[PDB]
């Protein structure tokens, strides 16, 4: 491929497998969680990355994912102890002010809405919870949803609107929108093209498209069709419908556990079980009803074990971060 992926930094802070990494909205700090039941906040001073704070005793079991609030103030952690901790720096140091309980089993994912006042979690109990944030340190459950028939892997909020997306072990993706007259949450649509567990999902810049990676070694591009659309696609219900407009196959050897769509460049990165990170770019002449995505660069030996998560940097265009079961965090720089 014409593009190249360059390794900038390698970090080995945790002991054991590292599950999730997340960029601060300022792009100069990131956090990481793993099997060691600890969260590490990493700040960039000069040209060197270092751990500035270490958070322990927040979770008794493995921490699967951490996600920053749109404000640089609060951090959320989903763990296997059926809890979701909220961290805030009220004392000049990060402390756990609130804990969100309710899930019967392990919590798999968290997500913040664009506004920052809505928080969504999903667990192995096939449920998706949505919380409201009244004031600081206080959270109120808005809805408990059980549409998925199997383990729910990930929850991601819409960039422009307050729409929730969930990927599940039941091979499906589900959209969630709030109903206008009653102000109660409900499921908008169901996306059924993957033949196995859907691990990761990410919205496009505008939010009218969506990537999804799955256990079937494929990634899919979903397009939102509103009622009365120009295309020949018809919506029987009033709600918008999503359609699989592109399927990338044969590119991955094993399950793809995470996918990230950059809002600055439009590049798509995949974290696969074959230890490989792959970069995809939409073609210049790709049609909006049959888009074509081509792999511009890849690092098949990006890690020594499975790559668990990949995340683009919101401030720095082309900077990617990733973690793996080899216990390493790697910051990358892609040049097309």
């Amino acid at each position: 491929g014409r593009g190249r992926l360059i390794l900038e930094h390698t970090l080995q802070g945790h002991k054991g497998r590292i599950w999730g990494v997340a960029w601060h909205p300022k792009g100069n700090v990131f956090a990481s969680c793993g099997e060691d039941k600890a969260i590490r906040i990493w700040s960039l001073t000069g040209n060197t990355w270092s751990t500035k704070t270490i958070l322990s005793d927040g979770h008794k079991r493995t921490i699967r994912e951490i996600r920053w609030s749109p404000c640089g103030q609060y951090l959320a952690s989903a763990s296997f102890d059926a809890t979701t901790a909220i961290w805030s720096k009220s004392s000049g140091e990060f402390e756990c002010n609130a804990t969100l309980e309710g899930h019967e089993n392990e919590v798999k994912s968290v997500s913040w809405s664009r506004s920052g006042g809505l928080l969504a979690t999903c667990s192995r109990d096939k449920s998706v919870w949505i919380w409201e944030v009244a004031g600081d340190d206080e959270f109120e459950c808005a809805a408990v949803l059980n549409p998925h028939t199997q383990d729910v892997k990930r929850v991601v909020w819409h960039p422009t609107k307050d729409i929730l997306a969930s990927a599940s072990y039941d091979n499906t993706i589900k959209m969630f929108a709030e109903e206008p007259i009653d102000n109660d949450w409900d499921c908008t649509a169901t996306l059924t093209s993957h033949t196995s567990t859907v691990w990761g999902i990410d919205f496009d810049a505008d939010g009218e498209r969506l990537v999804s990676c799955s256990d079937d070694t494929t990634i899919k591009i979903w397009r939102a069709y509103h009622p009365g659309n120009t295309a020949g696609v018809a919506t029987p219900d009033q709600q918008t419908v999503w359609k699989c407009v592109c399927t990338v196959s044969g590119q991955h050897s094993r399950a793809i556990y995470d996918v990230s769509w950059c809002k600055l460049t439009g590049l798509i990165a995949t974290a696969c079980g074959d230890d490989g990170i792959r970069i995809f770019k939409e073609s210049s002449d790709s049609k909006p009803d049959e888009p074509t995505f081509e792999q511009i660069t890849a690092e098949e030996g990006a890690h020594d074990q499975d790559v668990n998560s990949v995340q683009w940097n919101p401030v720095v265009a082309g900077q990617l971060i990733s973690c793996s079961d080899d216990g390493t965090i790697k910051i990358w720089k892609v040049t097309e």
Binding site: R61, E106, D215, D274, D304, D325
Partner: protein, 154 residues
């Protein structure tokens, strides 16, 4: 199908052991991973409910193991005792834990039920292939204790 007037009691007799490959390995030459080495890793795993190994119950067999050392790939096919055995997932999980501890991290292990040998083979295979659910299962102390009992070598 097998005949009723003809029955071969010799299967009881057929179980044996031969672990003599030392001469080839005596030199400095690398030794590839083979079906035999993986079989030696899982043949003596104990059944969770019965005082017999997975080899003695024919749950694991050497010719049900496929491996390519160069391509970093290992496939294990295990036949649980009876088609509606509720321990199929546990047995395959003990096989996974043993291989996870004994094999290099470069090896990608697939553990599936032998086709047509269990009523819920698709669902079990899907559980064993989900590395997240396997990890969460290993954080169950009672479950990890039973697995360790099956993996113990005595």
């Amino acid at each position: 199908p097998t005949e009723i007037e003809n029955i071969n009691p010799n299967v009881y007799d057929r179980i044996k052991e031969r672990v003599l490959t030392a001469n080839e390995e005596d030199e400095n030459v690398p030794d590839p991973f083979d079906k035999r080495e993986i079989f030696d890793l899982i043949r003596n795993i104990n059944d969770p409910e019965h005082p017999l190994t997975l080899e003695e119950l024919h749950v694991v067999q050497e010719d049900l193991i496929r491996i390519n050392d160069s391509q970093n790939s290992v496939h294990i096919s295990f036949t649980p005792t009876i088609p509606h055995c509720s321990m199929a997932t546990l047995i395959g999980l003990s096989i996974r834990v043993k291989l996870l501890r004994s094999l290099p991290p470069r090896f990608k292990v697939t553990v599936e039920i032998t086709p047509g040998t269990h009523a819920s083979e698709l669902a079990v295979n899907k559980q064993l292939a989900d590395k997240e659910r396997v990890a969460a299962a290993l954080e169950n102390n009672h479950l990890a204790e039973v697995i360790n009992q099956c993996i113990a070598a005595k």
